[PDB]
Amino acid sequence: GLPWYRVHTVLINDPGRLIAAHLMHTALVAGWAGSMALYELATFDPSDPV
Amino acid sequence: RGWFDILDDWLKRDRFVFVGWSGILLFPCAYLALGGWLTGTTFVTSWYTHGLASSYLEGCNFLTVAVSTPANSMGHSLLLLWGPEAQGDFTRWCQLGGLWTFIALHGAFGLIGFMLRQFEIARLVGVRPYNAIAFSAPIAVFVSVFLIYPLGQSSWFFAPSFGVAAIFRFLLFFQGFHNWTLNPFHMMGVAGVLGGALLCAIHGATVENTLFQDGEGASTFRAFNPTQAEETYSMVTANRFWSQIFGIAFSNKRWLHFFMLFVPVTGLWMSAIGVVGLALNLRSYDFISQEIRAAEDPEFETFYTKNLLLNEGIRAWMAPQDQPHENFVFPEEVLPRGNAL
Amino acid sequence: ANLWERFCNWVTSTDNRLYVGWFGVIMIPTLLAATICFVIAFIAAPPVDIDGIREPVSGSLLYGNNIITGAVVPSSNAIGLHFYPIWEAASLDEWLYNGGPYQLIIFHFLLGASCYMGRQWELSYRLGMRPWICVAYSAPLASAFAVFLIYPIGQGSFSDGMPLGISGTFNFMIVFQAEHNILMHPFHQLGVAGVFGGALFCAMHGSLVTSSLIRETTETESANYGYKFGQEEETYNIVAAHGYFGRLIFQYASFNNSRSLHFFLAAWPVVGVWFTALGISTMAFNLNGFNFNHSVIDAKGNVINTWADIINRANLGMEVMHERNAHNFPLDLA
Amino acid sequence: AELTPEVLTVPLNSEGKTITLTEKQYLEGKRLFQYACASCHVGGITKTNPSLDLRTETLALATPPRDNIEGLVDYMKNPTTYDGEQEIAEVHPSLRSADIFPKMRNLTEKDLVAIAGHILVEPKILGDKWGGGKVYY
Amino acid sequence: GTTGERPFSDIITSVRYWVIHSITIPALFIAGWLFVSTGLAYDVFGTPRPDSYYAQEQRSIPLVTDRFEAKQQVETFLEQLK
Amino acid sequence: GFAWWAGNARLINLSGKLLGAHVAHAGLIVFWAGAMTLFELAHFIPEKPMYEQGLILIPHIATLGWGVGPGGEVVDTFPFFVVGVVHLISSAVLGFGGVYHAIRGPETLEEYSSFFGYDWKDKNKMTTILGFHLIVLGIGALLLVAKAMFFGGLYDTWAPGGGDVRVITNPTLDPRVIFGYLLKSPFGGEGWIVSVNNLEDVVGGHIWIGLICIAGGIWHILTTPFGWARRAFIWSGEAYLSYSLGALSMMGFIATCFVWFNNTVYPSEFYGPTGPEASQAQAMTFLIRDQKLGANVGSAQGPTGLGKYLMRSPTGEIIFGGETMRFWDFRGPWLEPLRGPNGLDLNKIKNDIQPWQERRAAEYMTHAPLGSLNSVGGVATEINSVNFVSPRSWLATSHFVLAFFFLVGHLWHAGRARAAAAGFEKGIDRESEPVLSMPSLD
Numbered sequence A: 001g002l003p004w005y006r007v008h009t010v011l012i013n014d015p016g017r018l019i020a021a022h023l024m025h026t027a028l029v030a031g032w033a034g035s036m037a038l039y040e041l042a043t044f045d046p047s048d049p050v
Numbered sequence B: 001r002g003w004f005d006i007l008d009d010w011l012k013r014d015r016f017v018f019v020g021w022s023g024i025l026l027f028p029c030a031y032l033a034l035g036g037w038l039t040g041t042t043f044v045t046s047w048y049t050h051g052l053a054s055s056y057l058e059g060c061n062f063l064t065v066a067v068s069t070p071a072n073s074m075g076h077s078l079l080l081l082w083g084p085e086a087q088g089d090f091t092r093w094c095q096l097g098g099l100w101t102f103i104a105l106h107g108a109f110g111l112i113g114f115m116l117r118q119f120e121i122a123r124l125v126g127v128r129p130y131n132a133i134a135f136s137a138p139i140a141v142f143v144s145v146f147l148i149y150p151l152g153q154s155s156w157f158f159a160p161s162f163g164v165a166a167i168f169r170f171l172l173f174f175q176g177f178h179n180w181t182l183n184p185f186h187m188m189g190v191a192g193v194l195g196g197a198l199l200c201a202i203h204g205a206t207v208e209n210t211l212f213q214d215g216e217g218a219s220t221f222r223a224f225n226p227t228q229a230e231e232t233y234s235m236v237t238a239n240r241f242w243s244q245i246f247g248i249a250f251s252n253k254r255w256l257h258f259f260m261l262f263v264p265v266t267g268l269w270m271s272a273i274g275v276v277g278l279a280l281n282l283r284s285y286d287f288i289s290q291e292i293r294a295a296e297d298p299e300f301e302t303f304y305t306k307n308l309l310l311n312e313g314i315r316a317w318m319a320p321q322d323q324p325h326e327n328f329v330f331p332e333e334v335l336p337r338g339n340a341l
Numbered sequence C: 001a002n003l004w005e006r007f008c009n010w011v012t013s014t015d016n017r018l019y020v021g022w023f024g025v026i027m028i029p030t031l032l033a034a035t036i037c038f039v040i041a042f043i044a045a046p047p048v049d050i051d052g053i054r055e056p057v058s059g060s061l062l063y064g065n066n067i068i069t070g071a072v073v074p075s076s077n078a079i080g081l082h083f084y085p086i087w088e089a090a091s092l093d094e095w096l097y098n099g100g101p102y103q104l105i106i107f108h109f110l111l112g113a114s115c116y117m118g119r120q121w122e123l124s125y126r127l128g129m130r131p132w133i134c135v136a137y138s139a140p141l142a143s144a145f146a147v148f149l150i151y152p153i154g155q156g157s158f159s160d161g162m163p164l165g166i167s168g169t170f171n172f173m174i175v176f177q178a179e180h181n182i183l184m185h186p187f188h189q190l191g192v193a194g195v196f197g198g199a200l201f202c203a204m205h206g207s208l209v210t211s212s213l214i215r216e217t218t219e220t221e222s223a224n225y226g227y228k229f230g231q232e233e234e235t236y237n238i239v240a241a242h243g244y245f246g247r248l249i250f251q252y253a254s255f256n257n258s259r260s261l262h263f264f265l266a267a268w269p270v271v272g273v274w275f276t277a278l279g280i281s282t283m284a285f286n287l288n289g290f291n292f293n294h295s296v297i298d299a300k301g302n303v304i305n306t307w308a309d310i311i312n313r314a315n316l317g318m319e320v321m322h323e324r325n326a327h328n329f330p331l332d333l334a
Numbered sequence D: 001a002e003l004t005p006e007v008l009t010v011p012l013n014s015e016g017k018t019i020t021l022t023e024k025q026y027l028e029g030k031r032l033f034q035y036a037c038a039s040c041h042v043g044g045i046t047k048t049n050p051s052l053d054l055r056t057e058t059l060a061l062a063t064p065p066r067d068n069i070e071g072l073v074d075y076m077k078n079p080t081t082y083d084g085e086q087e088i089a090e091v092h093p094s095l096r097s098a099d100i101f102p103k104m105r106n107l108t109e110k111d112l113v114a115i116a117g118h119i120l121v122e123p124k125i126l127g128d129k130w131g132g133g134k135v136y137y
Numbered sequence E: 001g002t003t004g005e006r007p008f009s010d011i012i013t014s015v016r017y018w019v020i021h022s023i024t025i026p027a028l029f030i031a032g033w034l035f036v037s038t039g040l041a042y043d044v045f046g047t048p049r050p051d052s053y054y055a056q057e058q059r060s061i062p063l064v065t066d067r068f069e070a071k072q073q074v075e076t077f078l079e080q081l082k
Numbered sequence F: 001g002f003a004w005w006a007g008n009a010r011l012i013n014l015s016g017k018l019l020g021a022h023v024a025h026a027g028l029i030v031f032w033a034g035a036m037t038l039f040e041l042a043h044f045i046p047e048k049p050m051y052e053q054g055l056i057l058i059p060h061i062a063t064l065g066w067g068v069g070p071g072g073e074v075v076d077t078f079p080f081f082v083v084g085v086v087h088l089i090s091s092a093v094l095g096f097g098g099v100y101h102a103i104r105g106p107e108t109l110e111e112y113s114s115f116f117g118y119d120w121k122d123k124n125k126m127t128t129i130l131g132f133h134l135i136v137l138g139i140g141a142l143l144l145v146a147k148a149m150f151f152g153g154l155y156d157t158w159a160p161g162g163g164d165v166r167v168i169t170n171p172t173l174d175p176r177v178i179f180g181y182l183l184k185s186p187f188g189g190e191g192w193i194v195s196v197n198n199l200e201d202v203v204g205g206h207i208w209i210g211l212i213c214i215a216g217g218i219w220h221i222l223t224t225p226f227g228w229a230r231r232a233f234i235w236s237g238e239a240y241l242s243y244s245l246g247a248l249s250m251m252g253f254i255a256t257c258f259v260w261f262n263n264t265v266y267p268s269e270f271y272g273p274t275g276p277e278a279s280q281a282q283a284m285t286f287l288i289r290d291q292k293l294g295a296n297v298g299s300a301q302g303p304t305g306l307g308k309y310l311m312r313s314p315t316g317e318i319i320f321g322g323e324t325m326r327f328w329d330f331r332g333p334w335l336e337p338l339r340g341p342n343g344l345d346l347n348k349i350k351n352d353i354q355p356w357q358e359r360r361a362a363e364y365m366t367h368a369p370l371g372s373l374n375s376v377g378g379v380a381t382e383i384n385s386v387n388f389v390s391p392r393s394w395l396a397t398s399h400f401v402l403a404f405f406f407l408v409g410h411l412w413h414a415g416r417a418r419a420a421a422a423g424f425e426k427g428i429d430r431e432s433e434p435v436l437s438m439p440s441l442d
């Protein structure tokens, strides 16, 4: 079968599932940003900007 | 069949030294980088940037000549000949360090040209482009060490100077200041370089000692024809041998040769990453747990603490001369020193 | 059917999963002894007074070391080159304090590695091979002899042999540079050329062969499956490889004889490493690297520094700091 | 910079009289210093007794003052301790002891002046380096 | 195994080759020689002669300390010798 | 069937041309001995110690009694000139015979004479040539004895009064002494045969080896190899070469250590101080200097709690302190007058150090065998000034390199001899590949 390092080539000729993989990546990144913002809000001390 | 295709024809003719479109970039820049280095190491000083002699003309030999970096006060100036520092004065250009940027930048563009040449010839001859791919490791090392590294620091001054002993000095700087030997990215590079040298010696030796007898002479070299279809050595006997000496052995010539590409190329890419970190002084300098214990416990000693004392010797003893622009004056009483020495 | 002849037949049997052989009769025990003592010492040995000044150095994981900083510490300067087996100590406690395990390990390991090289000859003979793989391995082995035995012989003490540790290796390198200016020694320079070039030629050969694999597989499968173990046909096209590389440089700079090429692959790193091992082995007798300190002066007699003088400054800072409590007199003569 | 007569001009005696060395003299004294003295006195220190160097300031405080051609010439003939209280020909090369220090056998009176001259000139050129030790290398 | 150029071992065993290069090779060697022997190389490249690293009573390095006046700094250093 | 770069291997079965090669090559060895000595003599200056002057042949001659007097002072250089001249002349005689046999003489000897002709596989003839050469060598070793005992003696660094030439009238014959050296451990404070420290043992050992070499030469002319020996070895010219490469390698390594540690048959007066010697001498120098100033050197505690000047060795012996604690096994004529039964005697140290011992310690300290490859003397951070590299560093490093490569040559030719003897030095027979007939490992 495919070597492990080629598993994502099954999408080269499959625009719909390429679009689906691109959406999932966009979802992961935006979700990262939401989570990182929240972690920072929970740990940020705003009482002295100096 | 207009002029572009006529020129293409000519660039790509099969001559003693193939030219190609990539030759237009490669040959001037390679020649100039080389030319600049030989010119500077023969005739040009480092008196005004470093306070150093650095050419044959001044008394230096092959080990101590160098095209030294520009002065820290140049910042990251491109130091163009026609630029505002030298103002077209070739002599001043030389004395200010202009040849260092000249060599570094033409060298960079030569390496691009060389790698393009590996792409161009490979396309014309019908091979796959893995040699070009393998050359990315040399490029990553050059760019990370000669360009990225000083760009994170204050100036080109702290780049390596092009010379045998000057590079030796670079190695020693990175120990005293960056503790580079403690860096896991350097360690992976070391494993890749040594791993590759080992692969090289062990694969050549194996092939030469599992040769088929294909001729009658004691010189086994003659008994090879470049066009023969048969393997010239026994992969089966080689595999038995190593399986029984070492436990495991290669069985696939294709994996074997791909592994030989992979190991030194990966090793060099890894070290390049570490040097990027060192551009920022993002060092693997210390182990925090060790320093906490050592500070609290004066009988705790490791090879780790011992090397940092060495590093501290290097810094205090080399910095005044190696960083003259800083006007460091360390009186005798401040130099760290063991007993007697 | 004679009892000794059966044993002899099992020792040299080509049918054992790992070959034993006569060299292996010595190699198996001595490597096991070295390995077992090393594993136990790296984990649990107490601090060792490496420089004989009652300043014990902690090397093991249990006494506050990690993987990078741990070491089996060289035996005490007070012992010098004296033989210090277990049975020469009043107690194991004493043997541990003075660095006994280091001696046990390095002597068993050097023996077993020497028998490793012989075992390579030996199995080559039983399989009908040519003999010289062991000659390639003599380059690494000579290098281990240099830092574990020869350099300690010339300086007078196993306390200056290379520690069996990662940071200890680095300590050894730094102090070697201050005491011998090894960077300026041409045999170390040749070793760098053997090791850089060997890596270079490793990459070159691996990429040139890989560049010229004959199409045997589809895009959806590893090209490795295009080679089958023990096939008689070569799996790549060396004439295509020669045609590429010869055009990349020029024709006569490329090998078209596989036997010469692989011999070159073998020769270059082996010989560079011989020299670098010889470099360590001759600096053991203090024939040090080139000294250009104050070699350039001006018409008045001012010193004009060169990069060699800058190196010297670094070297001085390693010299004055190393073993900072161990010198009472002004010259570090060994 | 260059090796001008001013740098080559050194005190002849403690009275204040001076003498100007030729460059030939200086170079010959440097060679003779390397041949007979540098094995202990490289760079103006003293390997076997670092507490005493060949800096002009130290020689000026020696008894017999040795910061001059005559003082130095005499020292090479009949060396004393720093306070002048005891003669040390038996452990220090000198003409008085050329039997046990055979490199001194072939040294003429003009060689000694050249050696003496070199010692006095060199701190004028190298400054702190001369007699300063590894700190100034 | 050839692309049409004259073989090297043909060229340098030929009499015409050596007739030309017994002149061109020494002449270049001599030119390079004279480039140094006349002291031109020092002036072209700005390299200090052995007598012009320092002023007489000077042991400071004439170190460039400014980016845009660097050219004037060096010239100021060179005058401090003449 | 050899290439030009393996061209001498074409001489294996050409006994007459092979003789020319060996004899011409012996001439090169004699030439260099001759020429190097004349060069050393033309450059020699007697006011300077030999070891300040790059000499390695003249010190070997001096050690045999010629040309020196009390303390190693060179008295007469004519013996030096003679040794070089005679060697030099003798090399033309060897050159002549050498090129004659290699170019003009009979290509092979076995037709011309059954005596000088040989086949490598003739185990009887090979042992007869061995036995002849053993006898020569036994004679060689006796010539040293004869010099020591009947023709002037040898230089004795240990002779009372600074060293001197001394005839040896009671060579050690006791096999427990002679062979006891062969059984000491090579480790510290023992040093195997390198620890030999008096000329009586040196001369007696050569009596023994001389006789043993003659006995064995005679033995091997009269016998043939027994059957176990027949079955243990390869019988071919390249195998015999490989055996000798092994032995020369071992011998080179021994010589390296000899010149590095031994100051008896490598007198330090001539070769410079050993590494241990020089290190000990520095501790002596500063002990002397400091005690002259009033330091009580026995009670001075150093920074580590160990004595600054004097401490104990692991078996109790009073020894020099500082890093030279590693070097306490050193023995030398300038130091032994201070040794009592417990090691360095503190009362002798306070009362009996002599000016000549102070001189000698300063001299050896400042001539330690440390130096750069371009011959800058001293530690690697030293400035230029002193042009010096000890003969012992030159002689140790050079012979470690030759020993090393001769071990590699032993492996090369031993492995190849084995493979050629069995018929696969040229590669694997495609039609009869051994592995293809073995069962698979798994």
Ligand code: CLA
Binding pocket: A004, A005, A006, A007, A008, A009
């Ligand atoms: C936009 C960027 C991008 C995209 C879309 C691709 C896409 C592709 N690459 Mg390329 N590649 C990229 C960047 C990119 N690459 C970079 C930067 C490099 C250099 C490192 C490479 C080097 C490279 C090689 C060497 C190869 C490919 C191959 C492929 C194909 C198959 C990959 C696969 O199945 O992986 C499968 C991978 C895994 C199952 C696990 C890998 C896990 C990695 C090592 C670590 C985890 C990272 C982490 C999860 C998230 C990323 C963090 C950060 C990047 C944001 C696919 C078309 C393959 C190919 O050509 O096939 C024909 C192939 O051999 N790529």
Ligand code: CLA
Binding pocket: F003, F004, F005, F006, F007, F008, F009, F010, F011, F014, F017, F018, F020, F021, F022, F024, F025, F092, F095, F096, F099, F102, F103
């Ligand atoms: C000590 C070094 C040494 C010695 C003694 C020999 C000796 C020999 N070689 Mg080997 N060889 C050597 C090094 C040496 N070689 C090296 C380094 C190489 C590699 C470059 C070779 C490569 C080589 C090959 C390829 C072959 C030999 C062959 C031979 C033999 C025949 C030579 C012949 O016919 O040439 C004839 C040469 C000449 C007529 C030219 C003149 C030679 C003379 C002797 C010059 C000497 C001048 C000298 C100053 C004389 C002084 C005169 C007076 C004192 C009497 C001969 C016994 C040949 C052989 O084995 O035959 C089967 C052969 O095929 N050799």
Ligand code: CLA
Binding pocket: F019, F023, F090, F093, F094, F096, F097, F098, F100, F101, F105, F106, F109, F112, F113, F116
């Ligand atoms: C070990 C070296 C060696 C060996 C084995 C041989 C062997 C041989 N030679 Mg060669 N030869 C040698 C060295 C050697 N030679 C040298 C050095 C020279 C130059 C002087 C010659 C010149 C030479 C010529 C010109 C001829 C031979 C011939 C012969 C053959 C017959 C010899 C004979 O009948 O003499 C029997 C014995 C004698 C005649 C008496 C010799 C006794 C000697 C002189 C005394 C012993 C010397 C001593 C052991 C060491 C020297 C002293 C030194 C330490 C100062 C024989 C194959 C002949 C040949 O090939 O036939 C065509 C021939 O014509 N040889």
Ligand code: CLA
Binding pocket: F127, F130, F134, F182, F183, F212, F213, F214, F215, F216, F217, F219, F220, F223, F224, F225, F226, F229
């Ligand atoms: C260059 C010198 C030399 C050489 C090459 C030979 C070669 C040979 N001898 Mg001769 N031999 C010599 C000198 C030499 N001999 C001398 C001088 C004598 C007189 C004592 C003898 C006495 C002699 C006898 C009595 C016999 C031989 C035999 C043989 C053959 C077998 C050798 C063998 O098996 O060794 C291999 C050695 C062994 C298997 C055991 C050696 C054990 C040693 C002592 C232990 C060494 C350990 C250690 C690694 C080394 C350190 C030194 C140690 C002593 C501390 C072989 C042809 C045999 C033969 O066939 O004769 C017809 C035989 O029986 N030889």
Ligand SMILES: CC1=C(/C=C/C(C)=C/C=C/C(C)=C/C=C/C=C(C)/C=C/C=C(C)/C=C/C2=C(C)CCCC2(C)C)C(C)(C)CCC1
Binding pocket: A028, A029, A030, A031, A032, A035
């Ligand atoms: C469905 C839905 C929803 C929900 C959603 C969610 C809940 C989301 C989440 C998401 C998320 C929450 C995500 C996140 C993500 C994350 C990630 C993706 C991460 C990343 C990672 C990585 C990549 C890393 C890496 C690394 C490491 C680990 C180390 C260091 C280095 C690095 C950085 C490389 C809602 C309601 C809205 C709407 C409706 C629908």
Ligand SMILES: CC1=C(/C=C/C(C)=C/C=C/C(C)=C/C=C/C=C(C)/C=C/C=C(C)/C=C/C2=C(C)CCCC2(C)C)C(C)(C)CCC1
Binding pocket: B031, B032, B034, B035, B036, B038, B039
């Ligand atoms: C920079 C510049 C430029 C350019 C320049 C150039 C282009 C140059 C070139 C130059 C050159 C192009 C040079 C060359 C030189 C060379 C040489 C200098 C060589 C040498 C060599 C040798 C020395 C060798 C020898 C040897 C040895 C020693 C050992 C071994 C063997 C052999 C043979 C290798 C221009 C104009 C644009 C302008 C701007 C600036």
Ligand SMILES: CC1=C(/C=C/C(C)=C/C=C/C(C)=C/C=C/C=C(C)/C=C/C=C(C)/C=C/C2=C(C)CCCC2(C)C)C(C)(C)CCC1
Binding pocket: F020, F021, F024, F025, F027, F028, F031, F085, F088, F089, F091, F092, F094, F095, F096, F098, F099, F102
């Ligand atoms: C075979 C052969 C070979 C080799 C050869 C040989 C090795 C030879 C040898 C030879 C020889 C080895 C020679 C010798 C010679 C010598 C001589 C000829 C000598 C003479 C002497 C003289 C004349 C002296 C004089 C003098 C005197 C008496 C005194 C002092 C001074 C003088 C020094 C002047 C070859 C490889 C090439 C080639 C092939 C073949």
Ligand SMILES: CC1=C(/C=C/C(C)=C/C=C/C(C)=C/C=C/C=C(C)/C=C/C=C(C)/C=C/C2=C(C)CCCC2(C)C)C(C)(C)CCC1
Binding pocket: F177, F178, F179, F181, F182, F193, F196, F201, F202, F203, F204, F205, F206, F208, F209, F232
């Ligand atoms: C002179 C002298 C001396 C003496 C010496 C001597 C007495 C000697 C001895 C020596 C000897 C007496 C030696 C011996 C040796 C031996 C050997 C070296 C062996 C060898 C062996 C081997 C090699 C074997 C092998 C084998 C095996 C094991 C198995 C089977 C097979 C074969 C055969 C391979 C002395 C020190 C007192 C002092 C100084 C001088």
Ligand SMILES: CCCCCCCCCCCCCCCCCC(=O)O
Binding pocket: B081, B082, B083, B087, B088, B089
């Ligand atoms: C892509 C190709 C770029 C190559 C550029 C070639 C550079 C041309 C070199 C000539 C530079 C001469 C400038 C010196 C005089 C300028 C005077 C001034 O500063 O105004």
Ligand SMILES: [Cl-]
Binding pocket: B306, C171, C175, C321, C322, C323, C324
């Ligand atoms: Cl340290």
Ligand SMILES: [Cl-]
Binding pocket: C326, C327, C328, C329, F321, F322, F323, F324
């Ligand atoms: Cl000390």
Ligand SMILES: [Fe+2]
Binding pocket: B203, B257, C205, C209, C262
């Ligand atoms: Fe290959």
